[PDB]
Amino acid sequence: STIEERVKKIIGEQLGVKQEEVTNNASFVEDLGADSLDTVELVMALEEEFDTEIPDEEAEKMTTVQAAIDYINGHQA
Numbered sequence: 819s820t821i822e823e824r825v826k827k828i829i830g831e832q833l834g835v836k837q838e839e840v841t842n843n844a845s846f847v848e849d850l851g852a853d854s855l856d857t858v859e860l861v862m863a864l865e866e867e868f869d870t871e872i873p874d875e876e877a878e879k880m881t882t883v884q885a886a887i888d889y890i891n892g893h894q895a
């Protein structure tokens with residue numbers, strides 16, 4: 819599985835959303851129904867899956883699926 823696939827799987831699982839709905843340009847809050855808890859638990863799930871830290875100032879701007887994919891691809895452990 820590619821990093822795109824693994825990031826999308828974690829997002830779908832954390833947010834209770836179906837894969838077909840996790841499009842690359844989807845907004846976590848505006849398309850995938852993320853509530854405030856979801857935002858911190860999603861960051862935590864990505865950090866744990868990829869063994870990487872995400873600074874909160876960058877999480878605040880990480881508002882789409884592609885933003886999360888690009889962060890993870892760009893910070894490989």
Ligand SMILES: C[As](C)(=O)[O-]
Nearest residue numbers: 827828831832867
């Ligand atoms: C706990 As699981 C179904 O993402 O391996």
Ligand code: NA
Nearest residue numbers: 820822823826
């Ligand atoms: Na795919």
Ligand SMILES: [Zn+2]
Nearest residue numbers: 827828831832
């Ligand atoms: Zn899984």
Ligand SMILES: [Zn+2]
Nearest residue numbers: 834835836839
């Ligand atoms: Zn849905």
Ligand SMILES: [Zn+2]
Nearest residue numbers: 844845848849
């Ligand atoms: Zn949208």
Ligand SMILES: [Zn+2]
Nearest residue numbers: 862865866870
């Ligand atoms: Zn951690």
Ligand SMILES: [Zn+2]
Nearest residue numbers: 862865866869
């Ligand atoms: Zn940890």
Ligand SMILES: [Zn+2]
Nearest residue numbers: 865866869870
């Ligand atoms: Zn760890």
Ligand SMILES: [Zn+2]
Nearest residue numbers: 865870871872
């Ligand atoms: Zn951490």
